[PDB]
Amino acid sequence: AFTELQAKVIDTQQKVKLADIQIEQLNRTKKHAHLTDTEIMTLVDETNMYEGVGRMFILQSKEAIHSQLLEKQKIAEEKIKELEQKKSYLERSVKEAEDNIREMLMA
């Protein structure tokens, strides 16, 4: 029966679609969280520098920020691959049932 063969190709279809759009900004928000560090690295030192996780800008030493923000680089730096790991298998998984659709038809 091709129903679940048509059912699996629909679900894993929209599964893989997310890993493509996110991975690049994850490289960006990697690169930008390097840049925003370089952006505060622009002015050699300041107390009025802020890094924050919310509407609050909690006053922080840009140094600990350079760590935190290259850490924030490292945050989005990692998420590219776990998507690419998502991006890797899900592309094949949708065709798993599709491989079952067509062979049985070629059969």
Binding site: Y89, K95, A97
Partner: protein, 509 residues
Amino acid sequence: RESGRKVQSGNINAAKTIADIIRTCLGPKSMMKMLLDPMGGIVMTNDGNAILREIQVQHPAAKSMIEISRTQDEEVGDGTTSVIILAGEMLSVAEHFLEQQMHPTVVISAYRKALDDMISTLKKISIPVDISDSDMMLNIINSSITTKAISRWSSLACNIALDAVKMVQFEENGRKEIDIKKYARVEKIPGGIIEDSCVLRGVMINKDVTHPRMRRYIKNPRIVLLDSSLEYKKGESQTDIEITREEDFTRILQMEEEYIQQLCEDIIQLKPDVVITEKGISDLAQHYLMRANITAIRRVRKTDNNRIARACGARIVSRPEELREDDVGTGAGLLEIKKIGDEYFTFITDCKDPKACTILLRGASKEILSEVERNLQDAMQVCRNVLLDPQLVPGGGASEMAVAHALTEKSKAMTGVEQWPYRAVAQALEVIPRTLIQNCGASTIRLLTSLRAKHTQENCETWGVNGETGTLVDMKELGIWEPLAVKLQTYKTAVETAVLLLRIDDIVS
């Protein structure tokens, strides 16, 4: 609530009045029954069963006769019209004497003392038929298929039943189950004609095949039954949390895949190309079968797979985690999906298991197909009967008046009380002469005498009357034959019912 001598007489009346009209419908010579309805429905039949349906039963004895009628019908589907004629006699004979001679019990045991003497006589009158000679089966078959009066393309395809049923004879249980019909699985072909209708080995698979799901034509590559237990295990033997978000789609549906890929390999290891997987399939289980380009056919029924488990005669996998070619795809096997007329027809053939063969049924229409198959249905049932006991017995009153004497001789011997039940039961045997003397339209009382005269020396060995020849005859000179199988069955069947209704004096709400 219905009880007592009424139900006693009611045990007579129902089975009686049932059996009464029906003996006229018995025999190749048979006197048909008309029906009318207040609905206007008109029925012309010699068929008790068909009659046994549209008739109404306001007595459970009349209702339970339908039950024991379907019993023989469950069994064969012919002789049901015959079985009812036996007990209906018995209670109408022994009881009113012997229940007013006061007992349920005596004739009950005498029903067995009746049941054996037949078997006794059966070991004489029934003489072996061989399945090696087709006609030696087919003459019974030709006699069995002309019972429903189509000898036309039924007969030649009855060889196919003489083959397919005989060639799906298998499965010795150690008391040897092998004798059988059911394993023969009919093919349905639009187009073709009963001429070119001929067995292929194993089971020819029409049912789920409207189109190839299994390649087109496969010779060596193994047709393979994958049976449930192809669902994933996300753990080693276990199943953990399933896909939820990003990497679970990866990780989990991968965890699902490995276990099945592990299941997959064992299929491909035995070299299939077509693989028929019944329910309990994973898309995981197919796609590596797709990775080996070995078609995995999913979500298809059980008997069909059992047909296919009879088609290449492989088994059904009882441990899908550890697989064998001995399990599924046995022998060399074959798989051939053929368009004959309209529909692609999977033929899984070259069967291991002792052969196996199914009746190829090709009608031009499905009608000219069906007319054959219905009489074919007689052969394939008589085939299994010849398979069951391959002792062809002389028809007509040959067995009747034989056992009657031997019962009354057993009356002379035993000279007990049950001598009277014998002479009551031995009286039941004369039905076939009476039935046939009716259906020929002759005088019974001479032929009753003359058949007792046939037993007086010949012992009615092959000599009954045959109303169809109308005269008392050797059934070797008429070639009239039945297996000891069908005889005792029909014989024993109503005997049980003759016990059954006699047991029942009471109905309670």
